[PDB]
Write a structure and sequence with these properties.
This is part of a larger assembly, with chains A (138 residues), B (45 residues), C (111 residues), D (181 residues), E (66 residues) and F (80 residues).
Chain B: E1 2-5, E2 14-17, E3 43-44
Antiparallel strand pairs in B: 1-2, 1-3
Chain C: H1 5-20, E1 24-29, E2 34-40, E3 45-51, H2 61-77, E4 85-86, H3 95-102
Parallel strand pairs in C: 1-4
Antiparallel strand pairs in C: 1-2, 2-3
Chain E: E1 14-15, E2 31-32, H1 54-59
Parallel strand pairs in E: 1-2
The chains are: A alpha+beta (138), B mainly beta (45), C alpha+beta (111), D alpha+beta (181), E little secondary structure (66), F mainly beta (80).
The structure holds magnesium ion (61 copies).
Residues 122, 124, 126, 165 of chain D line the site of one magnesium ion.
The structure holds 6 RNA strands.
GO biological process, one term (chain E): translation
Subunit structure (chain E): Part of the 50S ribosomal subunit.
GO molecular function (chain E): metal ion binding; rRNA binding; structural constituent of ribosome
RNA sequence: UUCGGAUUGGGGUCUGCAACCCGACCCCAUGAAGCCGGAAUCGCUAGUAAUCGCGGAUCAGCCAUGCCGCGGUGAAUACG
RNA sequence: CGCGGGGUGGAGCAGCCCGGUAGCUCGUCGGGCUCAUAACCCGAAGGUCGUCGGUUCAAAUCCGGCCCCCGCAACCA
RNA sequence: GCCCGGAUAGCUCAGUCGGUAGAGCAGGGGAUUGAAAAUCCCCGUGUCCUUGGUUCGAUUCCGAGUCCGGGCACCA
RNA sequence: GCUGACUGGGGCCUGUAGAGCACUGAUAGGGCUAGGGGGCCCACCAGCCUACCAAACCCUGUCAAACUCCGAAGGGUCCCA
RNA sequence: UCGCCUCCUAAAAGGUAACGGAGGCGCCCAAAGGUCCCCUCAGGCGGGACGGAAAUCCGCCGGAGAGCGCAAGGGUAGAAGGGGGCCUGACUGCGAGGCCUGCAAGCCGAGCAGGGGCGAAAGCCGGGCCUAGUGAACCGGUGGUCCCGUGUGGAAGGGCCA
RNA sequence: AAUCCCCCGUGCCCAUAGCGGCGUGGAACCACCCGUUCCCAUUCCGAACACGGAAGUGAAACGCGCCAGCGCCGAUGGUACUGGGCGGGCGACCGCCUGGGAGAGUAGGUCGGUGCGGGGGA
């Protein structure tokens, strides 16, 4: 679906979306990227919704990298009210400047048009980028 | 198995712990009295 | 294999001595000679030295040692030094090292 | 005794051959032979440690040293084994007594093994010590065949100051170790 | 070697399909060794006696005469 | 159990830490550090109790010492 | 097990156009299962049953321990 | 969602507490008796204990998650 | 607590005026029969509820005891 | 009866924000490799190919209240004003 | 669900809530205690009869990932881990001074005296690496003991110590 | 007697002193070494510990150097964060002033420094 195996703890505190930053951000695997403009918990099911938008977009062809991953467990109560936490029910936490997705081995009009579809499936504003000197060497 | 432990004379002594099925014997060891100094001290009661 | 049994045994016995906080009467003994060095830690300093090597004497490494011990006492007691604790280093208290110690009375001592 | 033919043989004619072959700036660099450790593992005696001291009696007889007893490191289910119990005998011999035993092993024991087209030459442990193992104990002179209640073999380990197997091989060949080439 | 607990290990004599090994120096002096290989019967000092491989050797021999 | 709640415990705060700091006057017996492991080792004029508790052995001032891989150390300097 | 000789290794003999599939026999080696057989079940009343060998038919040879026969020794037991 | 019980050869049940050891009846398979089948008698096979994790030397057995089963509850509204 | 009565080879067990002891369905061997059984005939250290002690002498007598049972106790 | 809140300087204490991946775990892409999923040549040890499994290990790339090789600003306390 | 211990929440002193996220205790050990002496792991690779992923053995590499009775955390091989010999300080009489803290409690503790243990000694020793393994008072049981003893001597019954 | 250099003890800094490679040292220290009678030893082993030694060797160990492959250390500059003071956004969150300011990373560093005492050379 997309989801860890083996969690160390089942449930984990919500925490902040603060201080958009930190790792990812430089387009390491491919030709064009989709970078995140706003913070959000993006859900294992929005991710898959973007992936399949893209793979459907080119001929089963091209190559896709994803590069955000849903390891944060998301609980919800039933329509009860208040006793215990839980339950269920997975997200990737995504701040600004992150590259998720990032296609390669396809034409510019293709990548850019796939990434634009992929972006519509996301809860935040996005940015398509190409690749740079600035994306260094490493 | 709480442990009440005497020597021989005047019967005042000091108090201990063996919870156990070993040692099962007379369970005796060297201890100081309130009475003179450092005698034999056998378990009891 | 890091940090050998020698230097554990070494350190182990040393630290125990160093805690009591007396001056340290420290014993090196080689296959040939046997040396003894009275040290004050915290000033990081040797005070009274005695070797078989510098007393140029020989035969029966033990009887040599009682001598470098009597050598230390006489030498040391002359500086006021009386109480100390015996370092004994990585050496069994035995033989040569026991002998230097039981020669380190007429002064010094409790050893 | 400090005489002992193999010891002798090592000094006059094994050492010098060795120097001619590899060639050695130093007297020490030319391999000595230290430590033959003989280890019997016996699961055989497990709940019965009474059987054991008969086998220890046996090692002593052929070794001339009484063996110490190895006891179980950790506890393990699949074959019995409380972490208490005795597994086997292990006896360390050096220095003369290794020699007087290695001689006996070379010139008597190994000959008496059924088949024996010679000692395996891959058992060198790569840093140049060598190991082998034996099925029956009655291949030894000091054992009468009527004193065997049951067969138990052992693991012979031979430690060597040679840095490589090549050199190590040379030493034991030259000592008279029959090799399956 | 701790004093107690020990086989004697006293100089000995010993025998085989060969003559003596004067070397000895073992427990229990004067022992009889059944046969050795070293002393060069039986393998070492290769006897190669009784020798095999005659199985491919034969069938190609009795065959084309017959 | 699982849901209703199987959780819900905790234990009393142990109020652990340094109870006197560098350059602070103390008396014989004052305890200087409360701690779980050997987190500070006893130095000059400093005892350890059975629970790893460091106390002044003498009156004095307390000096802290970081002996690197030898640990940290608390001593009492006399002029007591 | 000097019991018992199944299995297998090598060596051969003979018949036969020819013995891999499938022959019988001799020798050396190999020596397995088997320490009187669960429920059950067969034959035999006398010169019988046990047990021991011998011949023939078919047939080149033979898988015959089969079959049809021959004699040697020779029991037990029938209240009913 | 709640609390209680459970899940083991083909079927139905023990064993779980109390760690080491899987048993009982039927069915199935091979043989016997009978003209034959059934009944009956002599033999045998057949399982990894829902599952994933963890504990321990060792887990059907103790602890946790999840999935099914059955039972009880769901009141004042 | 306690008074005490209850503790059998393989199980239920049955056995105290004391002087080396046992039955039935079991187990197995054996006769019977369609078999199951029943009936019939033969063998199983149970050192019989533990130690020290009276004696020649101990399931079965004296000091403690290990366990079991009901009925009565008590419980700050 | 000058010790107070607050403030200046000096020491000591700390493990958060940030960040990191050395530990505990999770984790994308590639590489090289144990065990095998087994295509099957076996049915004797064999035994090779993996566009599936896969430890560890290297490269690139990330995540964590109950992870930390690191780590501020602040905070606490003592001394002197 | 109710007391106790560990971790997080907890905002880098202490402290800090919720029917917040997760685990454990109601014991245990006469050695799993004291001391003196020695020893040093887990793992990986190579080698070795029965030995296999793992029984034992040999070699090299392995700064701690092992072990420390049990949960976690802090700690720890320069030992707190593993072995051995002696031993019972799992003593009596106290306790400067502090931690903690509304109270009552809980905790650490040098040092002195009596008599001891191990050690040549310095020294260490008033249980156990530590933090859970527990329960005010009242009422009563037992062993002791000096104390009280309702006219007096006893006794009844109490106190005191365990 | 100071001073320097080499060795032997022994402290301190606590990896800039480590690993690995290479090289070097025996007169003197030191080690390995010779032996196991004696003190004392090893759950077996004089391996270790211990003693009585001095023929040999610096092979091992140790000491001293030189290499930057690893390991370790590590700026300046810039950001993150933030005490204090102010804004902005429905929100999630963002920004400005003033004062503090990392971590990663880049540059580079490093094959140790040093105190006391001895023995030996100056
Ligand atoms: Mg980002
Ligand atoms: Mg990064
Ligand atoms: Mg959402
Ligand atoms: Mg409501
Ligand atoms: Mg969008
Ligand atoms: Mg090899
Ligand atoms: Mg070698
Ligand atoms: Mg807490
Ligand atoms: Mg044929
Ligand atoms: Mg017979
Ligand atoms: Mg028959
Ligand atoms: Mg008739
Ligand atoms: Mg015919
Ligand atoms: Mg015939
Ligand atoms: Mg079933
Ligand atoms: Mg049938
Ligand atoms: Mg039928
Ligand atoms: Mg389950
Ligand atoms: Mg398991
Ligand atoms: Mg109502
Ligand atoms: Mg003022
Ligand atoms: Mg300050
Ligand atoms: Mg963070
Ligand atoms: Mg990591
Ligand atoms: Mg954190
Ligand atoms: Mg730094
Ligand atoms: Mg003022
Ligand atoms: Mg933590
Ligand atoms: Mg806090
Ligand atoms: Mg805070
Ligand atoms: Mg609980
Ligand atoms: Mg002890
Ligand atoms: Mg190791
Ligand atoms: Mg290992
Ligand atoms: Mg191995
Ligand atoms: Mg640990
Ligand atoms: Mg623990
Ligand atoms: Mg921990
Ligand atoms: Mg007080
Ligand atoms: Mg108070
Ligand atoms: Mg005293
Ligand atoms: Mg004494
Ligand atoms: Mg005290
Ligand atoms: Mg009341
Ligand atoms: Mg009372
Ligand atoms: Mg009166
Ligand atoms: Mg009176
Ligand atoms: Mg009256
Ligand atoms: Mg009275
Ligand atoms: Mg460091
Ligand atoms: Mg020299
Ligand atoms: Mg020379
Ligand atoms: Mg060298
Ligand atoms: Mg840096
Ligand atoms: Mg800067
Ligand atoms: Mg601000
Ligand atoms: Mg604002
Ligand atoms: Mg920096
Ligand atoms: Mg370096
Ligand atoms: Mg120095
Ligand atoms: Mg000088």
């Amino acid at each position: 679906m997309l989801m860890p195996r083996r969690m160390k703890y089942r449930k984990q505190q919500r925490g902040r979306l603060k201080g958009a930053t930190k790792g990812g951000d430089y387009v390491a695997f491919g030709d064009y990227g989709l970078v995140a403009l706003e913070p959000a918990w993006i859900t294992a099911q929005q991710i898959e919704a973007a992936r399949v938008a893209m793979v459907r977009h080119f001929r089963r062809g091209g190559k896709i990298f994803i590069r955000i991953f849903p390891d944060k467990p998301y609980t919800k109560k039933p329509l009860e009210v208040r006793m215990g936490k839980g339950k269920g029910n997975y997200v990737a936490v995504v701040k600004p400047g992150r590259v998720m997705f990032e296609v390669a081995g396809v034409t510019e009009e293709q990548a850019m048009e796939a990434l634009r579809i992929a972006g519509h499936k996301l809860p935040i504003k996005t940015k398509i980028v190409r690749r740079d000197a600035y994306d260094e060497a490493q | 198995l709480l442990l009440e432990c005497t020597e021989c004379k005047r019967r005042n002594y000091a108090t201990e712990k063996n919870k156990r099925n070993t040692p099962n014997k007379l369970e005796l060891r060297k201890y100081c009295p309130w009475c003179r100094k450092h005698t034999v001290h056998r378990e009891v009661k | 294999a890091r940090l050998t049994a020698y230097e554990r045994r070494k350190f182990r016995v040393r630290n125990r001595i160093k805690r009591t906080g007396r001056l340290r009467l420290s014993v090196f003994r080689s296959l040939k000679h046997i040396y003894a060095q009275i040290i004050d830690d915290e000033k990081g300093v040797t005070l009274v030295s005695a070797s078989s090597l510098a007393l140029k004497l020989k035969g029966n490494k033990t009887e040599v040692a009682r001598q470098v011990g009597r050598a230390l006492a006489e030498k040391a007691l002359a500086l006021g030094i009386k109480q100390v604790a015996f370092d004994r280093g990585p050496y069994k208290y035995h033989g040569r090292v026991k002998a230097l110690a039981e020669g380190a009375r007429e002064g010094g001592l409790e050893f | 005794p400090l005489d002992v033919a193999l010891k002798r043989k090592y000094y006059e004619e094994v050492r010098p051959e060795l120097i001619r072959r590899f060639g050695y700036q130093n007297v020490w660099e030319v391999p000595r032979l230290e430590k033959v450790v003989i280890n019997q593992g016996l699961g055989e005696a497990k709940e019965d440690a009474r059987i054991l001291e008969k086998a220890a009696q046996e090692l002593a007889l052929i070794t001339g040293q009484k063996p110490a007893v190895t006891r179980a490191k950790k506890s393990i289910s699949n074959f019995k084994l409380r972490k208490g119990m005795p597994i086997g005998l292990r006896v360390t011999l050096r220095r003369d007594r290794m020699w007087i035993f290695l001689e006996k092993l070379l010139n008597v024991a190994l000959p008496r093994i059924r088949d024996f087209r010679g000692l395996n030459p891959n058992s060198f442990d790569g840093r140049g010590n060598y190991n082998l193992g034996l099925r029956e104990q009655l291949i030894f002179p000091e054992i009468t065949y009527d004193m065997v209640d049951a067969l138990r073999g052992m693991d012979i380990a031979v430690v060597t100051t040679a840095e490589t197997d090549e050199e190590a091989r040379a030493l034991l060949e030259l000592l008279g170790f029959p090799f399956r080439k | 070697m701790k004093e107690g607990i020990h086989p004697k290990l006293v100089p000995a004599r010993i025998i085989c399909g060969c003559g003596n090994v004067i070397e000895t120096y073992s427990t229990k002096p004067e022992i009889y060794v059944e046969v050795c290989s070293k002393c060069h019967p039986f393998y070492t000092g290769q006897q190669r006696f009784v020798d095999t491989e005659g199985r491919v050797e034969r069938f190609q021999r009795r065959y084309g005469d017959s | 159990a699982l849901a209703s709640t199987r959780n819900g415990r905790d234990s009393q705060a142990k109020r652990l830490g340094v109870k006197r700091y560098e350059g602070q006057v103390v008396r014989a017996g004052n305890i200087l550090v409360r701690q779980r492991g050997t987190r500070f080792k006893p130095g000059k004029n400093v005892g350890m109790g059975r629970d790893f508790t460091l106390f002044a052995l003498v009156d004095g001032v307390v000096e802290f010492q970081d002996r690197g891989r030898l640990g940290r150390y608390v001593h009492v300097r006399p002029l007591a």
